[PDB]
Ligand binder design. Sequence first.
Ligand SMILES: c1cnc2c(c1)ccc1cccnc12
Ligand SMILES: c1cnc2c(c1)ccc1cccnc12
Ligand SMILES: [Zn+2]
Ligand SMILES: [Zn+2]
Ligand SMILES: [Zn+2]
Ligand SMILES: [Zn+2]
Lengths: 374, 374
Amino acid sequence: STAGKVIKCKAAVLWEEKKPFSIEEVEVAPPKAHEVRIKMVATGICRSDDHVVSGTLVTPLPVIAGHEAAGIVESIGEGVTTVRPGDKVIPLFTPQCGKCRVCKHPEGNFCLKNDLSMPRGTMQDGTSRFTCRGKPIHHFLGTSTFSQYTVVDEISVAKIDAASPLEKVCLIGCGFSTGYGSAVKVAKVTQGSTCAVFGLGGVGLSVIMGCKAAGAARIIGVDINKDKFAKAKEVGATECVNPQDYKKPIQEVLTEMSNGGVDFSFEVIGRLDTMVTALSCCQEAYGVSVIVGVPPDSQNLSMNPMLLLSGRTWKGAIFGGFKSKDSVPKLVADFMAKKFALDPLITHVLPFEKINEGFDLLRSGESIRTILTF
Amino acid sequence: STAGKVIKCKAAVLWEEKKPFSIEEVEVAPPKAHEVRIKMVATGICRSDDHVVSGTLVTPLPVIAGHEAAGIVESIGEGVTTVRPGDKVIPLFTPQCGKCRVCKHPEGNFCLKNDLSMPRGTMQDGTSRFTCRGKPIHHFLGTSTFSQYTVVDEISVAKIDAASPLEKVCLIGCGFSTGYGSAVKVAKVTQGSTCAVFGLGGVGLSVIMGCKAAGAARIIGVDINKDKFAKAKEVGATECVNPQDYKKPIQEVLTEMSNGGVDFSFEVIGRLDTMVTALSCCQEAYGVSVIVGVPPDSQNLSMNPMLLLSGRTWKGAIFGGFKSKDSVPKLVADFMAKKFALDPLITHVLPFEKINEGFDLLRSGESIRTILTF
Ligand SMILES: c1cnc2c(c1)ccc1cccnc12
Ligand SMILES: c1cnc2c(c1)ccc1cccnc12
Ligand SMILES: [Zn+2]
Ligand SMILES: [Zn+2]
Ligand SMILES: [Zn+2]
Ligand SMILES: [Zn+2]
């Protein structure tokens, strides 16, 4: 009885940069062909959502942001074959069209239909399904999860276990999948290995979890905030190191600790200096360093390529290297089959309308993950 | 007959940097425990030998350089189990001790016993087997091939097919294996793939031969010297590009030519600008870019880490990523089996005593590869 009609609901609109989100009444158009309308149940607050606020992630405004979420299908446009009204679903901020050279590639996952490279802030057909008092509002990464209802292209949604707790599995829409995949899928951490993780927020913890799932012998957490350590240890970290405690450069400390360099290093914080450090502390002949985080923005790092000529590998990925529509449901199935825990990452839960408070907790560092409930 | 005794012979001694090599009468001590004295039959002139001349590659002087060679064992010290007097051998500038964390690693080849990282210019025991007028002369990379006779540690030598033409296979000691391995072993070039090779001197052509051995559909040669193109095409290149013919940046041209980026790219000339270019032109989601050459010395490159966050892999290696003692014999086996040709690389052949002439040909760029014959 809302199918095929406009829905009136609340969303969190960013009218301008460096402003709070504004709770507005919006009109959400019904789904056109190959589009899916979703009732949001929960959405996480991610660093990249805050980058939209600070102009760091350039995307058209005004916008409904949000990209880490889970909800329930309310209706499907014509042609949709992969989800039905009633299904529990996760929006995919990286799509899997299944047709482009990337989706066809055994390794690649950055589907060329993404809206991240050159953001249009629209549906795939170049239009928006959102208005706020007749004014068009842009989409974000084809997801736009800071709304009671959103419409997504079918390539940007996956059906998940009908019995999953959406307030938890929403993490699989970004933060968890991104860290966990980095270890398990991008670095392909091996049993017995020594790992180093730079950044112990939610994505870092997710990397640690992946390293533990992979059977790593040592997982060295690195952060200047020592209050992040207990939780890191709790999810699998063997040791934690605070660089401010040391007189000598941190890769030197990590090289000594690992008897000549770690097997896998991960930079989660998104900082140009720790990126080079992280490459450097991995073992010169067969070390792997993986980039996870976006920097505060643009600007080159400076780096000596002899770090690579000995044998090091340097790489990065989006969404932990996972092909989005194939992987998300199995990640959920694994969580349901108890192969990993999500509770440790969730430190704050708030009603959707206290969104701005949620961003305050992110910006101050007090939160690991805030989930907003609808 | 000379076994257990000092041999008087000639060598090319570099007494000082930026000097020409000096043909001197030297004394070559007999091999101690686990050492092997070799009569040299051929040695190539490699770019890294010239880096020793310019003070670019810092190693103790005075020195006997040379590291790409083949010859015959004239005697063995006690313990030597892997070669016998009379065996055709290739010295291994990257050793394979078989015992360190690296030789144990199924991907590493940069054996920790190497003398490249922190050059001592000695045998493994911290001594020299070379004197000139009683004065000690340093070794180089445990190989010192610019001598009628050398002594090397057993870890730095490999027995090869007794019917090998040593004037040809000597290229397996560095230049060929380095390029070819970069394609075959380091990048793991795949069938149907599109490859770009920056620099078409000898090591670049060896990359091209590797890409073709791996079954690439497209091999794009890139050099500012168009005179290098015919040989490039002759060993497997499908097209050649000279950046100076173009008005736009060469990675744009290569991205457009490859419909959105190459699968595998290789920087073979060792320049910082081409490194970034090479990386950039590879496909953003699953592209792999391999660094083969040593910069003109230090200088950091400047690079935007967003190039990696989309999914790019950036890596380097020494000696084409080959475990040296295991691999050198099989490469000769394959050459003997006619699985690849070495003649297209051999552009000049000179007697050992014209060493300086050979370096002039290298430095001017008239040579692909000069082989010196004893
Ligand atoms: C779009 C959305 N979220 C992300 C990115 C891009 C890139 C990096 C990243 C790292 C951690 C958490 N989320 C993101
Ligand atoms: C020792 C000897 N030869 C080399 C190196 C080190 C490093 C790089 C390289 C690249 C091309 C050819 N030779 C070498
Ligand atoms: Zn796709
Ligand atoms: Zn995110
Ligand atoms: Zn070793
Ligand atoms: Zn060499």
